[PDB]
Design an enzyme around this catalytic site. Structure first.
Site, PDB file in Angstrom:
ATOM      1  N   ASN A 299       4.055  -3.272  -4.549  1.00 32.43           N
ATOM      2  CA  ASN A 299       4.685  -3.345  -2.842  1.00 32.43           C
ATOM      3  C   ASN A 299       3.932  -4.045  -1.433  1.00 32.43           C
ATOM      4  O   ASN A 299       2.965  -3.551  -1.108  1.00 32.43           O
ATOM      5  CB  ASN A 299       4.913  -1.718  -2.268  1.00 32.43           C
ATOM      6  CG  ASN A 299       5.970  -0.935  -3.106  1.00 32.43           C
ATOM      7  OD1 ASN A 299       6.125  -1.452  -4.332  1.00 32.43           O
ATOM      8  ND2 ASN A 299       6.953  -0.386  -2.585  1.00 32.43           N
ATOM      9  N   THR A 300       4.749  -4.940  -1.642  1.00 29.75           N
ATOM     10  CA  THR A 300       4.340  -5.828  -0.064  1.00 29.75           C
ATOM     11  C   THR A 300       5.219  -5.917   0.776  1.00 29.75           C
ATOM     12  O   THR A 300       6.144  -6.919   1.141  1.00 29.75           O
ATOM     13  CB  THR A 300       3.954  -7.014  -0.965  1.00 29.75           C
ATOM     14  OG1 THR A 300       3.463  -6.961  -2.022  1.00 29.75           O
ATOM     15  CG2 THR A 300       3.245  -8.418   0.320  1.00 29.75           C
ATOM     16  N   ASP A 301       5.027  -5.602   2.398  1.00 30.93           N
ATOM     17  CA  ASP A 301       5.330  -5.912   3.600  1.00 30.93           C
ATOM     18  C   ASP A 301       5.012  -6.596   4.498  1.00 30.93           C
ATOM     19  O   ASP A 301       5.366  -7.398   5.266  1.00 30.93           O
ATOM     20  CB  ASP A 301       5.866  -4.815   3.862  1.00 30.93           C
ATOM     21  CG  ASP A 301       7.477  -4.659   5.041  1.00 30.93           C
ATOM     22  OD1 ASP A 301       7.480  -5.351   5.258  1.00 30.93           O
ATOM     23  OD2 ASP A 301       7.931  -3.441   4.944  1.00 30.93           O
TER      24      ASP A 301
ATOM     25  N   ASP B  34      10.420   9.270  -2.482  1.00 34.07           N
ATOM     26  CA  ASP B  34       9.435   9.675  -1.945  1.00 34.07           C
ATOM     27  C   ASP B  34       9.452  11.422  -1.591  1.00 34.07           C
ATOM     28  O   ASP B  34       9.729  11.657  -0.801  1.00 34.07           O
ATOM     29  CB  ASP B  34       8.563   9.111  -0.360  1.00 34.07           C
ATOM     30  CG  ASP B  34       7.934   9.888  -0.963  1.00 34.07           C
ATOM     31  OD1 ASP B  34       7.024  10.178  -1.708  1.00 34.07           O
ATOM     32  OD2 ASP B  34       6.878   8.744   0.032  1.00 34.07           O
TER      33      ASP B  34
ATOM     34  N   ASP C 101      13.171   1.481  -0.831  1.00 36.31           N
ATOM     35  CA  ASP C 101      12.226   1.941  -0.534  1.00 36.31           C
ATOM     36  C   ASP C 101      12.022   3.463   0.079  1.00 36.31           C
ATOM     37  O   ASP C 101      12.523   3.175   1.504  1.00 36.31           O
ATOM     38  CB  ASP C 101      11.306   0.511   0.362  1.00 36.31           C
ATOM     39  CG  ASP C 101       9.972   0.660  -0.174  1.00 36.31           C
ATOM     40  OD1 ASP C 101       9.458   0.957  -0.295  1.00 36.31           O
ATOM     41  OD2 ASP C 101       9.230  -0.121   1.229  1.00 36.31           O
ATOM     42  N   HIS C 102      10.975   4.015  -0.828  1.00 43.75           N
ATOM     43  CA  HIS C 102      10.784   5.606   0.366  1.00 43.75           C
ATOM     44  C   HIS C 102      12.158   5.913   0.453  1.00 43.75           C
ATOM     45  O   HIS C 102      12.780   6.387   1.713  1.00 43.75           O
ATOM     46  CB  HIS C 102       9.978   5.366   1.454  1.00 43.75           C
ATOM     47  CG  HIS C 102       8.719   4.826   1.106  1.00 43.75           C
ATOM     48  ND1 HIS C 102       8.181   3.622   0.426  1.00 43.75           N
ATOM     49  CD2 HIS C 102       7.716   6.211   0.919  1.00 43.75           C
ATOM     50  CE1 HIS C 102       6.062   3.944   0.282  1.00 43.75           C
ATOM     51  NE2 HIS C 102       6.041   5.008  -0.123  1.00 43.75           N
TER      52      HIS C 102
HETATM   53  O1  LIG Z   1       6.569   1.611   2.230  1.00 42.58           O
HETATM   54  C1  LIG Z   1       7.084   0.964   2.770  1.00 42.58           C
HETATM   55  C2  LIG Z   1       8.073   0.328   3.706  1.00 42.58           C
HETATM   56  O2  LIG Z   1       7.067  -0.655   3.928  1.00 42.58           O
HETATM   57  C3  LIG Z   1       8.116   1.014   5.035  1.00 42.58           C
HETATM   58  O3  LIG Z   1       8.426  -0.025   6.242  1.00 42.58           O
HETATM   59  P1  LIG Z   1       9.419   0.271   6.980  1.00 42.58           P
HETATM   60  O4  LIG Z   1       8.330  -0.342   8.528  1.00 42.58           O
HETATM   61  O5  LIG Z   1      10.860  -0.321   7.478  1.00 42.58           O
HETATM   62  O6  LIG Z   1       9.477   1.890   7.688  1.00 42.58           O
HETATM   63 NA    NA Z   2       8.709   1.921  -3.362  1.00 41.84          NA
HETATM   64 ZN   LIG Z   3       5.329   4.243  -0.201  1.00 41.45          ZN
HETATM   65 ZN   LIG Z   4       4.244   5.668  -0.482  1.00 46.69          ZN
END
Ligand SMILES: O=C[C@H](O)COP(=O)(O)O
Ligand code: NA
Ligand SMILES: [Zn+2]
Ligand SMILES: [Zn+2]
Ligand SMILES: O=C(COP(=O)(O)O)[C@@H](O)[C@H](O)[C@H](O)COP(=O)(O)O
Ligand code: NA
Ligand SMILES: [Zn+2]
Ligand SMILES: [Zn+2]
Ligand SMILES: [Zn+2]
Lengths: 292, 293
Positions: free
Chosen positions: B239-241, B104, B82-83
């Site tokens: 995307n879900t965090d 990204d 991710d990113h």
């Molecule tokens: O969109 C990217 C992730 O949700 C950001 O997570 P991070 O706080 O581990 O960079």
């Molecule tokens: Na992503």
């Molecule tokens: Zn993002």
């Molecule tokens: Zn983004």
């Protein structure tokens, strides 16, 4: 690399030092223990209880440890089943890749404890896995210990000399029967194991209380008693409570100081550091530092 | 088992549903995500940020996921960077065993974003790894740029900017996404699309966090209705965090508050896992990936 428990403990036995045996329940605990061993140049005994195995799954417990030993291939590491309660549990741990298993039948009479331990030893030794057993509840009878070790062929023994598990070990003053310990060591001439060996150091206690925690009249084994235990022939020192208190103290602190914090890493990075420091100090105290 | 990201997302694209992409930073989060996927019979997209990879170590990130996929071999699982911020980061992820990587470069002009994305795609595709990129910043996506970007880069899925942002604080007032722009992007690119910053902050999760003494500072997520409309418009990866973190930490805070003598890690993290699992299960049903195995 990952090795039979006896490989690490025979060296500690011959050279007269203690190896901390550190429990873990997840990645954060495990990482901090390994970083401590890397920084102190110390062998590692990593332990998982049956409850920890249920929580992680035995496949993840073994798998995470194997990843960590590949990350630090110069460190001798044994993976140990702590307080296995049945033959089948010990056998599952052997099959999954543990390199040491403890069978705890000390609540049985001597003959039944010996029979069950011997069964575990036969199975584990056939698989190249070391075995720990326990004698005493009442304190160990050294003459029982001598016969038990000879007949079972167990690799290491936990003799009851006055400790107990948890943060509340002594209703009064700490007291361990070192004369009994020395007699057991003289008669068995094998590595010995101290259970319930957390110390609750003053700085760890202070951190927990500063974070709003309550340690209900707790008392651990004084550092001097741990050192005297090693002088008496203890070579494996089971440590769990100290790690939990130091870890959770930092979790509580982060929760208290920022109510909008929900990044897990902001809680568990300081928690890992405090746990790591407890382990590093314990390795120095017990004499396993700089033994790689 | 562990599969290329496009295997999961092409199916979602063709059948018109969304697959949650759930971030993890440790074992507790990962286990709860997997139990959710098992219980809802849903494919899993597992994501790790660069920060999460630094925290776990990339060997442990990949290793834990491989253990989990062997525990649940009937579940399609993709492991996604991710990113990713540089070619080298994406390459390290490919070498470590990720099956999807995101580069990204959306803060660059079109030409530089396209150049770097194309470099990542060539490297990743040669290794059998799918690639996500991002277009738009805030400035929203130009659909005609999206069309050319996808044709020239050969990227597998695209995150077009249509009005979301990361974190808990997404909307200064009322939530608003540009669904007409989304539909145009979808029609011109005809690939799976990705929604970033897609946490909803459900009412029950907010209430749990506040009950535990937390402060969410007036944070607002994407309403469930907007998530469903985004899937209707062509979003296939969501995307879900943030939602997972809030639900998890709410339970940790609660345990700390209700028993000052508690220091068994499992007593904190078992209820936290359960809360996270339930967020994931509901999100899988909302987005339409339940019962798709
Ligand atoms: O969109 C990217 C992730 O949700 C950001 O997570 P991070 O706080 O581990 O960079
Ligand atoms: Na992503
Ligand atoms: Zn993002
Ligand atoms: Zn983004
Ligand atoms: O002796 C031990 C730890 O002693 P301690 O409490 O740290 O003084 C271990 O062998 C324990 O058996 C272990 O910590 C128990 O773990 P769980 O059963 O709670 O997982
Ligand atoms: Na033990
Ligand atoms: Zn014990
Ligand atoms: Zn014990
Ligand atoms: Zn015991």
């Amino acid at each position: 690399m990952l090795v039979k428990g006896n490989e690490i403990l025979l060296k500690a036995h011959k050279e007269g030092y203690g190896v901390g045996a550190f429990n873990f329940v997840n990645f954060e605990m495990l990482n901090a223990i390994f970083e401590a061993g890397n920084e102190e140049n110390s062998p590692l005994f990593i332990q998982a209880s049956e409850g920890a195995i249920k929580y992680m799954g035995i496949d993840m417990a073994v798998g995470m440890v194997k990843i960590m030993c590949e990350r630090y291939p110069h460190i001798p590491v044994a993976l140990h089943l702590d307080h296995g309660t049945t033959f089948e549990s010990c056998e599952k741990a052997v099959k999954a890749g543990f390199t040491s298993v403890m069978i705890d039948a000390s609540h049985h009479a001597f003959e039944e404890n010996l029979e069950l331990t011997s069964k575990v030893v036969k199975m584990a030794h056939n698989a190249g896995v070391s075995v720990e057993a326990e004698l005493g509840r009442v304190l160990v009878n050294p003459k029982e210990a001598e016969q038990f070790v000879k007949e079972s062929q167990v690799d290491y023994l936990a003799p009851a000399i006055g400790t107990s598990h948890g943060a509340f070990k002594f209703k009064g003053e700490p007291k361990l029967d070192f004369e009994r310990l020395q007699e057991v060591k003289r008669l068995t001439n094998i590595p010995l194991v101290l259970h319930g060996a957390s110390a609750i150091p003053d700085n760890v206690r202070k951190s927990y209380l500063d974070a709003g925690g309550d340690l209900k009249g707790s008392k651990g084994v004084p550092f001097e008693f741990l050192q005297e235990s090693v002088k008496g022939g203890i070579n494996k020192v089971n440590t769990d409570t100290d790690l939990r208190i130091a870890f959770i103290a930092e979790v509580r602190k982060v929760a208290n100081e920022d109510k909008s914090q929900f990044d897990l890493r902001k809680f568990f990075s300081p928690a890992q550091l405090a746990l790591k420091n407890v382990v590093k100090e314990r390795m120095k105290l017990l004499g396993s530092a700089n033994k790689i």
